[PDB]
């Protein structure tokens, strides 16, 4: 079962208060340097880790009462998950993944994330030629440095669902 | 100069780097500096502390051969988490690789992490101590302290192929905190730091990882003989070699 962990106390008060939908976007995506969420061996630096944000971030704050937290990113994915955008997309992605690896570990989760509405909206984006192009050619940053391609990574997440 | 430096980690500073770790790291910055010249992988402390500005980490190829050697003798080592372990596996994104795909798994010597890790009697630290030497955050490694090692055979005909990288400040997985003269920043205590190359990635297709740590705690470890890497211009390739994953223990 998960207990919170130790380690990156700032990002534990980050979030103890109700943060907008608007702005869950801003740090699960993390193209701004001052919402970027990531830890010392996250796979890639320069975008945020949503494990890190659910890890460290959100969970420790929903235990200490702030529940508002989970519809908020509910709807920060969905928005976020139907935006026709590829980091948006990828990274609404990840933060599903994300769930799934903290499961993994902990075994079980303070709360889990209603992702009807999500999965829908991830798996009709998928079957979008401009949107699929757009994830086979994106090598902004650190995608630069893998010829495997995002939309190759975001497919091969989609099968563990 | 030293200025531009001090200048240049606060632009690039990480979110997950804390007000101590921040102090720490400007403060003791000129002691990884001489480090650095004493090595001789830099010939100045102002070399060192443009090459951090710069994020080019150029070094002489007298210097990167003779570091090899320790490697050669008696290995490499990457102590991990079990949780960071799974993540090899089970992260979909990372595509069955012990490290960054194309990229990499960055290493230390073995024998700089039998030395640094063991006491003199033979026996292993506190999760507690070691957490510290690591510069890691406390508990990381509560439930085991694992390690990634290629055995002297694989680490000698990997050289042979070339395959030996360092690191630089475009390496993905680098960060504020990665630093120049193929050394890792361990904090305030810099005779904890170790020496950093970068080896290349053991695939771990169809490998499960329930399988490896049910049998890493039957034995001990998990082992991959002949192991597939993938070298830097992304190709699939078997050498011949040992690769362990332990749990450690005295």
């Given at each position: ?15 103890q ?5 608007n ?12 919402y ?14 949503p494990?890190?944000?659910?890890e ?7 235990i200490?009462?702030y ?6 990113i509910?709807?920060?994915?969905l928005?976020?998950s ?8 990828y990274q609404a ?6 769930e799934?690896?903290l499961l993994?570990?902990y ?6 994330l209603?992702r009807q509405?999500?999965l829908?909206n991830?798996?009709?984006?998928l ?5 699929r192009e ?10 630069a440095?893998?010829?495997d391609?995002?939309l ?7 099968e563990?669902? | ?8 980690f ?6 997950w ?11 003791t910055?000129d002691?990884y ?6 090595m001789?992988?830099?010939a100045?402390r ?5 090459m ?13 051969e ?15 988490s079990k ?20 990229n990499?798994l960055?290493?230390?010597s073995?024998?700089?992490?039998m030395?640094?890790?063991?006491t003199?009697?033979?026996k292993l630290?506190?999760a507690?101590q070691?957490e ?6 406390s508990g ?6 694992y ?19 360092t690191?630089?400040?475009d390496?993905?997985?680098?960060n504020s ?11 305030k ?13 053991i ?7 329930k399988?490896?740590?049910?049998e ?11 192991p597939?890497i993938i070298?830097?211009?992304?190709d699939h390739?078997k050498?011949?070699?040992?690769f ?7």
């Amino acid at each position: 079962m998960y207990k919170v962990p130790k380690g990156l106390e700032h990002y534990q008060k980050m979030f103890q208060k109700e943060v907008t939908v608007n702005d869950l976007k801003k740090y699960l995506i993390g193209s701004d340097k001052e919402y970027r969420i990531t830890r010392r061996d996250s796979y890639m630096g320069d975008i945020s880790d949503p494990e890190v944000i659910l890890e460290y971030g959100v969970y420790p704050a929903f235990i200490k009462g702030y529940t508002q937290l989970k519809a908020n990113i509910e709807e920060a994915l969905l928005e976020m998950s139907n935006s026709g955008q590829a980091l948006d997309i990828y990274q609404a992605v990840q933060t599903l993944n994300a769930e799934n690896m903290l499961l993994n570990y902990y075994e079980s989760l303070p709360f889990y994330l209603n992702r009807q509405s999500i999965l829908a909206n991830i798996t009709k984006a998928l079957k979008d030629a401009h949107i699929r192009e757009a994830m086979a050619h994106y090598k902004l940053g650190e995608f630069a440095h893998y010829q495997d391609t995002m939309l190759d990574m975001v497919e091969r997440t989609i099968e563990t669902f | 100069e030293r200025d531009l430096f001090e200048k240049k980690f606060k632009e690039i500073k990480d979110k997950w780097v804390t007000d101590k770790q921040a102090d720490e790291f400007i403060e003791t910055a000129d002691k990884y500096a001489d480090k650095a010249v004493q090595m001789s992988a830099v010939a100045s402390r102002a070399e060192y502390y443009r090459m951090y500005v710069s994020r080019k980490y150029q070094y002489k190829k007298e210097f990167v051969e003779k570091l090899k050697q320790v490697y050669k003798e008696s290995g490499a080592s990457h102590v991990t988490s079990k949780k960071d372990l799974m993540l090899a596996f089970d992260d979909a994104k990372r595509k069955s690789t012990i490290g960054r795909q194309e990229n990499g798994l960055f290493v230390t010597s073995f024998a700089e992490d039998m030395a640094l890790l063991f006491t003199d009697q033979g026996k292993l630290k506190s999760a507690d101590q070691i957490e510290n030497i690591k510069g890691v955050d406390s508990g990381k490694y509560s439930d085991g302290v694992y390690q990634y090692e290629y055995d002297s055979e694989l680490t000698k005909n990997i050289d042979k192929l070339g395959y030996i990288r360092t690191a630089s400040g475009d390496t993905p997985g680098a960060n504020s905190l990665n630093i120049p003269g193929c050394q890792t920043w361990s904090g305030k205590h810099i005779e904890n730091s170790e020496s950093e190359l970068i080896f290349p990635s053991i695939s771990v297709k169809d490998l499960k990882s329930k399988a490896v740590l049910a049998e890493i705690d039957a034995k001990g470890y998990f082992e991959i003989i002949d192991p597939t890497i993938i070298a830097p211009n992304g190709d699939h390739k078997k050498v011949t070699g040992r690769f362990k994953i332990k749990k450690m223990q005295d």
